[PDB]
């Protein structure tokens, strides 16, 4: 499960950053998360994994109808290439999106902090596989990386939607539904972690340079991802990088799984078998 | 032209999106911290 957990975190996050549909990027972020708790499952940390489900439930669900708020308002368009400037145009959704993004990154004293950083802190402070640690650390940085992409393309940019703009969130059903999950996400982990009885042994004696790495790794994941994302502002010659050509097409996984074995078994049924 | 002009211009920088509400945040900090400081001083 360390083997499966580690690869799941990378590949889903690796394909996450190079996608364009809002729903796709958010979903890939989930599948990156489901990679996390099973990594924690392996090293005698089930309850933290189960606690990670609780905190992940709040903001991850939230990120969807906030994107759903953008999608329906801006004429059911899911391509990140067609929003921008929604910060001052969609205030509540922009606040809700960045709250979920910060929570999703385990940023301190929030829903994510009470689960993710304890997980990243615990995974290193144990006798595990080395290659799993490098992957979880990189995944967390990539976890923040596509989060910047969502805020950068969807909100912090010049508008790109069709001319007739119909964006609006003033419907009370939209406002109240998101607000409930908002006030939930701000505290959630603080209430739950302080309240549930101690069920594991929180390690204490532990050096600084992997204590801070729960937040260090995402600082760069914010930093260079922002630098590479805003590079699109500069008028530059377009060239498809091979790694991008790999990542953007879902790491080539569907084009082989969903074509090669499916063709063979179906063909085996016709040529052999039935005939 | 409209995509870059009108009210849709003057887009906030990337960081300012994260630091949204910091002004009122730090404003609520001093009142809350000052309240605790006197309450702890009374204690």
């Amino acid at each position: 499960t360390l083997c499966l957990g580690a690869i799941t975190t990378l590949f889903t996050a690796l394909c996450a950053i190079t996608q364009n549909d809002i729903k796709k990027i958010v979903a890939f972020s989930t599948s990156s998360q489901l990679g996390l708790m099973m990594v924690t499952i392996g090293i005698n940390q089930p309850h933290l994994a189960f606690l990670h489900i609780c905190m992940h439930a709040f903001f991850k669900a939230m990120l969807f109808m906030c994107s759903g708020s953008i999608i329906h308002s801006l004429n059911d368009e899911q391509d990140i290439r067609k929003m921008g400037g929604l910060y001052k145009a969609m205030p509540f959704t922009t606040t809700a999106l960045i709250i979920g993004s910060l929570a999703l990154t385990g940023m301190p004293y929030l829903t994510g902090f009470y689960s993710k950083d304890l997980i990243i802190e615990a995974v290193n402070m144990s006798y595990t596989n080395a290659w799993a640690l490098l992957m979880t650390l990189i995944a967390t940085s990539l976890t923040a990386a596509y989060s910047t992409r969502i805020i950068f393309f969807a909100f912090l940019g010049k508008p790109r939607f069709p001319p007739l703009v119909l964006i609006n969130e003033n419907n009370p059903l939209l406002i109240n539904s998101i607000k409930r999950l908002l006030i939930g996400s701000i505290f959630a982990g603080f209430i739950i972690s302080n309240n549930i009885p101690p069920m594991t042994v929180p390690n204490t004696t532990m050096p600084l340079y992997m204590k801070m790495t729960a937040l260090i790794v995402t600082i760069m994941g914010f930093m260079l991802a922002l630098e590479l994302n805003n590079t699109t502002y500069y008028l530059k010659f377009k060239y498809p990088s091979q790694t991008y050509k790999f990542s953007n097409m879902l790491g080539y996984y569907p084009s082989i799984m969903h074509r090669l074995p499916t063709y063979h078994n179906l063909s085996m049924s016709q040529k052999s078998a039935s005939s | 032209a409209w995509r870059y002009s009108g009210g849709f211009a003057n887009n906030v920088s990337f960081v300012g999106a994260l630091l949204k509400g910091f002004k009122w945040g730090f404003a609520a900090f001093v009142v809350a911290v000052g309240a605790e400081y006197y309450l702890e001083s009374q204690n």
Binding site: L164, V165 | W2, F8
Partner: peptide, 20 residues
């Protein structure tokens, strides 16, 4: 059918917001 919603669409200009 009948419109008259609290909002109104705009053409390439900033849509109206509300105090709330």
């Amino acid at each position: 059918a009948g419109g008259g919603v609290h909002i109104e669409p705009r053409y390439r200009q900033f849509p109206q917001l509300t105090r709330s």
